[PDB]
Amino acid sequence: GSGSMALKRIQKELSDLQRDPPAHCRAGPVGDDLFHWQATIMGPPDSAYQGGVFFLTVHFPTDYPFKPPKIAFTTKIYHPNINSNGSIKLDILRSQWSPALTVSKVLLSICSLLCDPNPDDPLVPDIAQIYKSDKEKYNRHAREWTQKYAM
């Protein structure tokens, strides 16, 4: 139809989540709209983000899974590839997307990005500079932002 194959896939993903919940996240519909999810991610242990819980929105496009989900943080987080509007500049969310990737694997990928930033082509230059210049200062900021917004 139009959106029907998308609806079936998203429901399948949701059922797999509810059946076998992952260690790294929880996610599911906001409301009775399968195409609009809220998600939560845990800060990786032994990192500036440890203890933090970070909220995200997932909007599936009508031609999901062939086009990527739109994923943005709603919790403020300090990172050179995630800006203050929550936008995540990540290749698998754009040109390196694969239809074989599930929302669970994408959320785990996002978790992984937290301690593996790309400061060379950053979304937030000021934070990348601090990452390259003074890592301790960076870690301090990431830790304090976690404490302030994600706990």
């Binding site: 194959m5 079936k8 896939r9 399948k12 899974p65 062939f66 086009k67 997307w97 694969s98 239809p99 074989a100």
Partner: protein
């Protein structure tokens, strides 16, 4: 139509990989264990199931997880794929999808959804499990 099996030795998926063999497909889409296809190639250069020439490495491994096949993009199982008129397919890199999912994914990028290897319309074929 149930679990993938080799029509020569008649071992199921589990029993095939458990002893170190691979699951392989000919280019004509016929599935065998590696030991049976190799021993067959030793006696003739034709496919055991359809007789097309398969000499000069016209076969390759396929990677399936369960023994029961399904498309990782649409998430339909074999039955649902076939009853619809869709085909089960494998890329030359051995990755399996329903035909409509792989087509549609190729409209957006020329890479295998599973392993990112360059592919096109000429680098995947049906398989007949």
């Amino acid at each position: 139509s149930g679990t993938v099996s080799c029509p020569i030795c008649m071992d199921g998926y589990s029993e095939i990989v458990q002893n170190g063999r691979l699951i392989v497909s000919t280019e004509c889409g016929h599935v065998f264990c590696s030991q049976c296809l190799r021993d067959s190639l030793k006696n003739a250069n034709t496919c055991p199931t359809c007789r097309k020439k398969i000499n000069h490495k016209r076969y390759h491994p396929i990677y399936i997880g369960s023994g029961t096949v399904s498309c990782p993009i649409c998430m339909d199982g074999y039955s649902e794929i076939v009853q619809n008129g869709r085909l089960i397919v494998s890329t030359e890199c051995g990755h399996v999808f329903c035909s409509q999912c792989l087509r549609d994914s190729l409209k957006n990028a020329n890479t295998c959804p599973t392993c990112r290897k360059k592919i096109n319309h000429k680098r995947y074929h049906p398989i007949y499990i």
